[PDB]
Amino acid sequence: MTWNFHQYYTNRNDGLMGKLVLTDEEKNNLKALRKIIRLRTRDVFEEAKGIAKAVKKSALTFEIIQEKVSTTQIKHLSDSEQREVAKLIYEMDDDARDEFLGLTPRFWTQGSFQYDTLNRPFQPGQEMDIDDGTYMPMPIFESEPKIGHSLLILLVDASLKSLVAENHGWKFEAKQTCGRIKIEAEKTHIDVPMYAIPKDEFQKKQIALEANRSFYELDSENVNLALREGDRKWINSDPKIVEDWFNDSCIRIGKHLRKVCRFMKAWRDAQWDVGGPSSISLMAATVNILDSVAHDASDLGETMKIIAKHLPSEFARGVESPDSTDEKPLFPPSYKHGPREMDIMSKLERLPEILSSAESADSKSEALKKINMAFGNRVTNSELIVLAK
Numbered sequence: 001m002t003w004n005f006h007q008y009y010t011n012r013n014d015g016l017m018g019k020l021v022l023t024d025e026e027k028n029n030l031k032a033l034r035k036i037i038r039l040r041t042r043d044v045f046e047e048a049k050g051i052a053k054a055v056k057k058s059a060l061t062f063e064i065i066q067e068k069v070s071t072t073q074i075k076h077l078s079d080s081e082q083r084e085v086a087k088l089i090y091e092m093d094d095d096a097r098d099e100f101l102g103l104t105p106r107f108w109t110q111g112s113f114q115y116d117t118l119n120r121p122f123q124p125g126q127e128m129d130i131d132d133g134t135y136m137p138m139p140i141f142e143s144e145p146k147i148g149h150s151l152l153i154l155l156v157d158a159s160l161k162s163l164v165a166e167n168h169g170w171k172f173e174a175k176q177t178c179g180r181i182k183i184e185a186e187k188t189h190i191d192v193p194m195y196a197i198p199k200d201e202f203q204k205k206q207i208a209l210e211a212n213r214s215f216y217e218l219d220s221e222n223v224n225l226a227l228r229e230g231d232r233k234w235i236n237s238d239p240k241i242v243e244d245w246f247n248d249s250c251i252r253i254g255k256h257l258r259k260v261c262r263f264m265k266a267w268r269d270a271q272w273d274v275g276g277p278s279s280i281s282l283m284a285a286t287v288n289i290l291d292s293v294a295h296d297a298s299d300l301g302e303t304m305k306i307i308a309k310h311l312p313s314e315f316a317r318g319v320e321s322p323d324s325t326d327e328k329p330l331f332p333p334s335y336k337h338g339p340r341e342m343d344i345m346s347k348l349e350r351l352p353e354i355l356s357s358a359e360s361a362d363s364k365s366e367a368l369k370k371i372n373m374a375f376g377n378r379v380t381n382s383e384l385i386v387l388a389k
């Protein structure tokens with residue numbers, strides 16, 4: 001016997017796509033959460049600019065500034081953090097202060113929510129992730145921006161911490177590249193990386209944008225990611241580079257690319273409760289395979305076998321980042337594998353065996369059980385599986 005799994009993979013009700021794609025409850029929940037973070041962040045910046053405006057108009061003592069700070073949403077930072085914000089506002093000169101009073105944070109989501117590969121989480125501890133970047137248009141800087149790294153990080157933190165203080169079961173986490181709100185009971189977190197971008201170009205592009213529509217991309221090397229730990233405060237990491245690479249890959253390869261990428265992530269979620277290869281390494285390897293190996297989009301069962309066969313080789317050679325400015329590969333080459341990478345290799349080598357043995361199982365029932373060794377017990381309708389012609 002030979003079974004075909006195309007429907008097992010693609011059926012939008014019962015099949016794997018059916019199990020992975022967010023419910024509307026989940027999708028609207030994520031957008032509502034993002035809206036709440038965006039609102040609070042703009043409010044907090046307005047509150048801080050309010051104080052700075054006061055400083056400009058009349059010379060206010062440091063103590064008066066502290067007092068004013070302690071009355072705003074910034075009160076949700078620790079005591080020493082509040083004093084630091086007051087100190088930073090008190091201490092900036094006319095020029096920096098004028099820049100600050102002209103700053104309004106802007107937002108743009110990146111990651112799987114943006115390019116539509118966000119899967120419903122599988123094991124306990126696994127969470128849906130929305131990556132909403134905050135952008136701070138300021139003058140081009142070589143060393144350090146007019147408005148300080150410290151100040152900007154503190155305000156975004158205050159915004160996030162102020163929301164946690166208003167929501168049972170939310171908690172704040174600081175990561176190296178973002179601030180995070182975790183909502184365990186909803187299996188969700190929102191990440192907020194922060195970027196500096198050129199103010200003049202931002203304005204020019206926004207003016208162009210609004211004039212040319214009725215009812216754009218910045219210079220990549222000036223998109224600066226703020227880093228929270230380490231002595232390097234900023235790194236040139238433009239998230240649009242990955243978004244564009246993936247969207248262009250989808251165009252070039254076809255619409256089955258997003259599906260097979262979801263499947264590989266689902267495989268990952270089933271094989272490890274935490275850990276496994278990154279989502280981006282899986283996408284990059286999969287793109288490389290589909291660009292170079294003949295396949296048929298009308299049988300994702302066959303396509304998934306083709307991918308599984310070639311993944312070990314991709315990862316063994318090291319997976320290069322689509323961002324050539326990246327300082328490391330997305331996955332190291334095999335001569336540099338330690339325990340972590342060896343564990344990944346051994347699971348990848350297992351996958352094509354699982355898919356093969358499912359294909360040659362004795363019944364539809366046994367076929368389902370076998371293939372569910374790769375993706376977990378998510379699909380339950382064995383009648384999705386069809387005897388190959």
Ligand SMILES: CN1c2c([nH]c(N)nc2=O)NC[C@@H]1CNc1ccc(C(=O)N[C@@H](CCC(=O)N[C@@H](CCC(=O)O)C(=O)O)C(=O)O)cc1
Binds near residue numbers: 109110238
């Ligand atoms: C990213 N970006 C970027 C660029 N270039 C390079 N080289 N790297 C970059 O990272 N260019 C554009 C952008 C950076 N510049 C901008 C960033 C944000 C905005 C802005 O007005 N954001 C809106 C939200 C837009 C939105 O919801 N958008 C929705 C999409 C629309 C929708 O879903 O309705 C969303 O977040 O999903 C806001 O702040 O309220 C305007 C410009």
Ligand SMILES: Nc1nc2c(ncn2[C@@H]2O[C@H](COP(=O)(O)OP(=O)(O)OP(=O)(O)O)[C@@H](O)[C@H]2O)c(=O)[nH]1
Binds near residue numbers: 112118278279323
């Ligand atoms: N240049 C570069 N950007 C990265 C890297 N890892 C993550 N990013 C950026 O961060 C965004 C989100 O990354 P992840 O959350 O790991 O990946 P995801 O595609 O959202 O996957 P899931 O959250 O697992 O669904 C990506 O779209 C990239 O913009 C990396 O190694 N190099």
Ligand SMILES: Nc1nc2c(ncn2[C@@H]2O[C@H](COP(=O)(O)OP(=O)(O)OP(=O)(O)O)[C@@H](O)[C@H]2O)c(=O)[nH]1
Binds near residue numbers: 129
């Ligand atoms: N621009 C840019 N953004 C990134 C990059 N890496 C991560 N991000 C963003 O910051 C978020 C958190 O990044 P990470 O520190 O990689 O998160 P993580 O290590 O996967 O999470 P844990 O495994 O729980 O520590 C991501 O989801 C992205 O939104 C990067 O290289 N460039």
Ligand SMILES: [Mg+2]
Binds near residue numbers: 111112113129130131
């Ligand atoms: Mg993500």
Ligand SMILES: [Mg+2]
Binds near residue numbers: 111129131
């Ligand atoms: Mg994230």
